[PDB]
Design a protein around this ligand. Structure first.
Ligand SMILES: Nc1nc2c(ncn2[C@@H]2O[C@H](COP(=O)(O)OP(=O)(O)OP(=O)(O)O)[C@@H](O)[C@H]2O)c(=O)[nH]1
Ligand SMILES: Nc1nc2c(ncn2[C@@H]2O[C@H](COP(=O)(O)OP(=O)(O)OP(=O)(O)O)[C@@H](O)[C@H]2O)c(=O)[nH]1
Lengths: 360, 360
């Protein structure tokens, strides 16, 4: 089959990371998140995948040209000269997806999940109407689309309202299957796929809901990046324990790259993704973190629940907490305390930041 | 001579330490505040000194009758059953200071100086008046009893405890030479030596001032305690340089007891004094701190401008800054941040203290 991934949206949440590297190329547990999605639907059964790019096209082109030989399936690219919103990917590549009269996958690159291509296409061949949505049960995650649905019929009869969610407590999961009739029902005007035109399809009775099995997160925000990282690590523990690194100086679930080395007397705590070539000196407690590629953490430093970017150097006796995110190649001077700091790339922090504050 | 040290009682400023060990007995740079006074009195040529106790005379008097035979001067004691303040024990010891027609030292128990007893008494007999006090220059004279000192002789023109209008700049250094005729003047009823005795003294022209050389501080507060140990280690750098332990990984002036040990890869930063019997683990950075007797600081901690009392166990990856005083036998758990924490005796801390608070 075929698959469309919307991969050019500027990533304005998750900003100190996406100011350098695009949003799906951001390393998510020693892999870009787009590589997770295209590997899942490489092994699933769509043999030709389109991804539509409007933002930093050249390095996405770099790793996509290096990647479609590496998968075996085709990586076609819907390039544009102007951002066409959430739905314009369907309209610019309308000439390529309409050639077959079969439905297709519309994927979103911020989602991390366990993907049901299987149950997606069997459920979509069951329900007989046009549109099919994944939907996940939530408590606070409402920012998404509220869906009012019944039982197994799953025919959506009422739709999206963002706040004060008294009717549903389950929301959208950013992964749909759509037939070609909607694919040429909508303009090439810049518009959203889930605000303007999905409401028409919920009014029309085309829209169905499939409840996802568990482990859903979207990593649009860095807090949600870290929670999705912990969720991905405990769902990686059950399936294959063979990949999680073990040790006396480690705790729980950790994902260290083979390039990355850990110094002795370290207590690498639970839920830590250490990227390629990262260097941890002697006596570093790191919990709930994700250190990305080639970043150095010096000795006697404490790190909890914080994202270290690409090639950042963190000094000695540094304490980082409250989801502090460092951008690309940031230097933290010695004996400082960062609580809440979002540091834009190529900065050299000289004083301790004890409260959440963007440092640019 | 005779020497009268009014030793305070209840030690409310500098409270977490004095809740276990009285203020004359808390070790300031590895020996107690009274011990600096009485070794300088034994070097001064004072024949026997008397200290005017009112609170916790068990441990205090047992220490004085220990070192009475070590200094070689009779460390006599004025017990009180209720506190008489600052001019009451002048009148309780009326007979025990009225026996000789010789002047006597009246010393605050909390001032730490580079005392000039010879200068003070042999400045005193040059004018022979009823009282000759020590004065020092300071930047905020509204906290301390100011004087008006004239040119080349030093008659106290006026004396007010809190000026509030800015009369002048010199202040009470907390050391006096009093003549026995001022003894019988005031009564046993408790009052202040500064409000009434000295302000009627200055009306006559019997109070005098001797300008100090420098390095005056009264250690009432823990902030004044740490500023005073900074200045005392400076005086040791000027005068007796071998007393300070400097080595390879030592930064600045450090005064270590011989019984105290320090691990490798640690940085014992400037103006630090380690008391007796402490044990310092590997990977710490201790700057501007005092660590009192037998306390433990575990690995990879960062301590700055803090007081760690007797038998405390500061855990691993622990940050402490901003005049955080620990009382006797306080256990800090692993990876906690204490900014400003005054911690009551026999407490176990299990949460971070992000703002200056009292923990009880
Ligand atoms: N090619 C392209 N992709 C887009 C465009 N707008 C949104 N997308 C993609 O749509 C997917 C989901 O959109 P969003 O969740 O709103 O993410 P976003 O566009 O990065 O915006 P923010 O979350 O506000 O930072 C993301 O993978 C985006 O890359 C666009 O104009 N062109
Ligand atoms: N013997 C004795 N000396 C006292 C007593 N009260 C005050 N003093 C002395 O009076 C002088 C001024 O007192 P402070 O500077 O306030 O020190 P403190 O008595 O410890 O009291 P705080 O620091 O305010 O809690 C100091 O030298 C004390 O030593 C007392 O009740 N008995």
């Amino acid at each position: 089959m075929k698959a469309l991934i919307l991969v050019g949206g500027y990533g304005t949440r998750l900003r100190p990371l996406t100011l350098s590297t695009p949003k799906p190329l951001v390393d998510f547990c020693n892999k870009p998140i787009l590589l997770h999605q295209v590997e899942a639907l490489a092994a699933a059964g769509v043999d030709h995948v389109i991804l539509a790019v409007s933002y930093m096209s050249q390095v996405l082109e770099k790793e996509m040209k290096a990647q479609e030989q590496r998968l075996g399936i085709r990586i076609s690219m819907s390039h544009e000269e102007e951002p066409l919103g959430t739905a314009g990917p369907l309209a610019l590549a309308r000439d390529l997806l309409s050639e077959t009269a079969d439905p297709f996958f519309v994927l979103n690159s911020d989602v991390i999940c366990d993907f049901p291509f299987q149950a997606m296409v069997q459920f979509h061949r069951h329900h007989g109407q046009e549109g099919s949505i994944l939907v996940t049960k939530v408590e606070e995650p409402s920012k998404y689309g509220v869906v009012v649905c019944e039982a197994d019929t799953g025919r959506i009869h009422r739709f999206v309202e963002k706040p004060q969610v008294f009717v549903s407590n389950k929301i959208n999961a950013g992964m749909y299957i759509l037939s070609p009739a909607v694919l040429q029902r909508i303009q090439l005007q810049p518009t959203s796929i889930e605000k303007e035109v999905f409401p028409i399809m919920a009014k029309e009775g085309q829209l169905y809901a499939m409840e996802l099995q568990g482990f859903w997160m979207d990593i649009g925000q860095p807090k949600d990046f870290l929670t999705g990282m912990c969720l991905f690590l405990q769902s990686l523990r059950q399936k294959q324990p063979e990949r999680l690194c073990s040790g006396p100086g480690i705790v729980g679930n950790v994902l260290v790259d083979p390039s990355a080395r850990i110094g002795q007397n370290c207590s690498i705590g639970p839920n830590v993704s250490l990227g390629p070539g990262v260097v941890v000196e002697d006596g570093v407690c790191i919990r709930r973190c994700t250190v990305l590629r080639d970043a150095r953490i010096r000795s006697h430093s404490w790190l909890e629940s914080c994202i270290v970017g690409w090639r950042c150097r963190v000094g000695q006796w540094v304490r980082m907490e409250n989801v502090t995110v460092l951008g690309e190649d940031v230097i933290v001077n010695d004996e400082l305390y960062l609580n809440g700091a979002s540091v834009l790339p190529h900065k050299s922090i000289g004083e301790s930041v004890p409260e959440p504050r963007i440092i640019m």
